[PDB]
Amino acid sequence: GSSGSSGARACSQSSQTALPTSLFTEGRYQQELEELKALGFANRDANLQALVATDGDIHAAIEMLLGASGPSSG
């Protein structure tokens, strides 16, 4: 005991048979987009791009939609 931090593997993509379907996220977190529209958003596309970014976790989406990107570069 001295430091505190967890790792457990590093990088692990999970995709093969799956395909990039645009109409595959508008049917998953459809209600979500509507939620943010009330939580304090509206930009569905953005709400999605963020949601999908959080695995469709509106919660994590909010923060991300709140302006909590994190990394910066351009």
UniProtKB/TrEMBL annotation:
Domain of life: Eukaryota
Record-annotated UBA domain positions: 27-68
UniProt protein name: Ubiquilin-like protein
The organism of origin for this protein: Mus musculus (Mouse)
Gene name in the database record: Ubqln5
